[PDB]
Design a protein around this ligand. Structure first.
Ligand SMILES: Oc1c(Cl)cc(-c2ccc(Cl)c(Cl)c2)cc1Cl
Ligand SMILES: Oc1c(Cl)cc(-c2ccc(Cl)c(Cl)c2)cc1Cl
Lengths: 110, 114, 114, 110
């Protein structure tokens, strides 16, 4: 499992559950092609997005649908979504900590 | 000054100087059109990107070139850039301050709206 | 103005107004003695805590009363307060900006030193 | 395991390993008494600090020796340490994300 996403809610102190995540890889024409997607689990995590075979060097985008998450809680958020763009050159954990008007993201590469 | 960007360096405890910032607005055909650009000053701030008149309702993307910043300090960072995407002026003109706190493998962004 | 505190609210995207701040300095007997205190203004800032003359070398603690802030908004937060502990003026007088970004279960603090 | 600490390094994108952590409980005379301590493991985590029986309601302080961590990497840090003070009223994860001049802490309560 080379790529894992974890999403946390800073308002409620809890995993961010059922948050949609879309992963894209940059194609040779500088366009983003769909690569993987899912919804975070009860633990705020999304595993099994890809395999070592498929996860070749390249530029990836992870898009987290933070707007839909805050709207379900009745809170008006600022951002349309959160995006994390990085080059893969090798276990990657992308973590995001969400508030309505702020987010932080961190990469743990182990 | 309806749109301001402030960028700080969490490694050196200093403003992040000479950071390139590009702003885009989503077009009628869902394309990102260039809107404004600049570089942060010695105080880590970028003012003067736009005017009230030009800054109409829409979805904007503020792209901060964090990679070039870290590379020039001899650090190879994780992210290609930091992107902030938001709807602006939805219910009338607001002033927006977009702040970013930068580390090589992490960044935080906050908005202050008034 | 060698010591400044800026506090932002990540829930409302606004400065955090009327937040109590207490500063202490470590005494000769390793006790925290009161040094200065105040409340953040409408811009979330607290200036005028001290002067260059009074702000001598030492270990300082800036305690931000985040709990009272969240309670007054009807939120029961996790932390009792946010504490920032640092050595100041170790190699001559510096100016220190201590920034805090607040959420009910999380806070971040950054220092800008010049 | 009601109390867990996780510490991450934002400069290197890695767990913060061998970081000393001291936990204190507020005594009736408003003094801090030692409660538990240890060093984070390879995964930046510290488990087995206390038991359900011992972890009664009260005010706790978690102190993370961030200064010693940065000094071992040859980087001059700002803070003397990072402190997290909270009331326990029930699995608590305290996470800290460390930079030389900045830290963030978050509580996940599940
Ligand atoms: O995480 C932070 C922190 Cl702790 C502080 C700021 C910030 C914003 C505005 C100003 Cl004028 C300053 Cl001094 C700091 C931004 C972010 Cl994103
Ligand atoms: O700012 C933070 C903080 Cl304080 C903690 C995390 C984080 C990352 C991984 C795990 Cl397993 C946990 Cl519990 C927290 C992420 C971010 Cl982005």
């Amino acid at each position: 499992c080379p790529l894992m996403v974890k999403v946390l809610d800073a308002v409620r102190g809890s995993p961010a559950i059922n948050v949609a995540v879309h992963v894209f890889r940059k194609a040779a024409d500088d366009t983003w092609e769909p690569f993987a997607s899912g919804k975070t689990s009860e633990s705020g995590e999304l595993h099994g997005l890809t395999t070592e075979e498929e996860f070749v060097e390249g530029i990836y985008k992870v898009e987290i649908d933070t707007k839909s998450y805050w709207k379900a809680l009745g809170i008006s958020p600022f951002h349309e979504h959160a995006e994390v763009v990085f080059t893969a050159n090798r276990r990657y954990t992308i973590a995001a900590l969400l508030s309505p008007y702020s987010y932080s993201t961190t990469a743990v590469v182990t």
